[PDB]
């Protein structure tokens, strides 16, 4: 995959895409 | 963190698999 | 202010509400 | 949970406050 | 709620989330 | 160039078209 | 309106020009 | 404006309720 | 239309909106 | 990691995966 | 193609690698 | 390119019709 620079909901739009059904903990 | 590093810098789509459950 | 939210739309809709505070998605709950 | 509340059903924002660390 | 820095469609993606069915006037 | 647009997708699709000019969403019309 | 045109039905962009201040 | 202030600065999800209808 | 400054998926969210069914070649 | 992706959601989901490499959408294939 | 794989059906990411120039 | 010019500068929704198929 490529090393992508995510900020804002972009980050969460990625986290979603990866894990999806499992979940994820977003904590800045 | 990797919640920041991605924004400061870059990060993989493996680096972000960790925070999954 | 009472919509259907499913998928990204939801976890985007979290980011604004809580944001820095943090939040969590866990479909299996 | 979050989905049942908000997807199948719907919810206010005060109902999304609820899943915030 | 938190004080969020929106620019671009992000702004409108927010305006949507809030009002939704009522509407909104976007005028920059 | 003739798609179904519903929700954010729409009001995002306005932002590009009109933008600075301004636009308005008013489902109840 | 905008929805009927573009959601239930569909529309071009010249049909979105139309709701621009 | 609050169409700018949000971008220049920050704004609440109350500040944005006003422009609703 | 208006001259819009797109970067990131925004660009592709635009490319999509325009062409859609025809396709598009994204090559940076 | 096995979701339904349709529309923008898809061609956004390409951008992250491939990105600079480039990619292509061609529904008619 | 991409849709059948991922829309009607579903797919992994290794299945999206596949449409990358 | 117009994959850059848009980001560096601005671009129309005609400029982007070209890369379509
Ligand atoms: Zn969507």
Among residues I26, B18, I24, the alpha carbon closest in space to that of A26 is found at B18
Strands E24-26, F23-25: pairing kind: antiparallel
d(CA G19, CA G9): 16
Q: Where are the alpha helices (DSSP H) in chain G?
A: 2-3
- Contact call for residues F26 and G2 (beta carbons, < 8 A): yes
Work out whether the CA dihedral G7, L3, F15, K7 comes out positive or negative: positive
CA C9–ligand 1 middle distance (angstroms): 6
Strands C23-25, A24-26: pairing kind: antiparallel
Please name the residues in contact with J15: beta carbons below 8 A apart, sequence gap of 6 or more: I8, I9, I12, I26, J23
3-state secondary structure of J12: helix
First to last CA, chain L: 18
- Contact call for residues E17 and C4 (beta carbons, < 8 A): no
d(CA C12, CA I13): 16
d(CA A18, CA I18): 27
Q: Where are the alpha helices (DSSP H) in chain J?
A: 8-17
d(CA L17, CA I25): 11
d(CA E12, CA E25): 10
Which residues in chain I touch residue F3, judged by CB atoms under 8 angstroms apart? 17, 20-21
Burial class from Cβ neighbours inside 10 Å (0-12, 13-18, 19+) for residue G9 reads: exposed
Chain breaks in chain B (C to N over 2.5 A) after: none
- Contact call for residues E2 and C20 (beta carbons, < 8 A): yes
Please name the residues in contact with E25: beta carbons below 8 A apart, sequence gap of 6 or more: F22, F24, G21, H19, H21
d(CA J25, CA L7): 21
Resolution in Å equals: 3.2
- Asked if A23 lies within 8 A of B16 by C-beta distance, the reply is no
Rounded to 5 degrees, what are φ and ψ at H19? Answer: -75, -10
The alpha-carbon gap from J7 to the nearest alpha carbon of chain I, in Å, equals 8
d(CA E9, CA D17): 23
The count of other CB atoms within 10 Å of the CB of residue D16 is 22
Which residues in chain A touch residue J3, judged by CB atoms under 8 angstroms apart? 17, 20-21
Kindly state the helix (H) or strand (E) to which residue L18 belongs, with its residue range: none
Please name the residues in contact with H13: beta carbons below 8 A apart, sequence gap of 6 or more: C16, C17, D13, E1, E4, E14, E18
Which technique?
A: electron diffraction
């Amino acid at each position: 995959f490529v090393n992508q620079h995510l900020c804002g909901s972009h980050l969460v739009e990625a986290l979603y895409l990866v894990c999806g059904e499992r979940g994820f903990f977003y904590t800045p | 963190g990797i919640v920041e590093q991605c924004c400061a810098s870059v990060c993989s789509l493996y680096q972000l698999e960790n925070y999954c459950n």
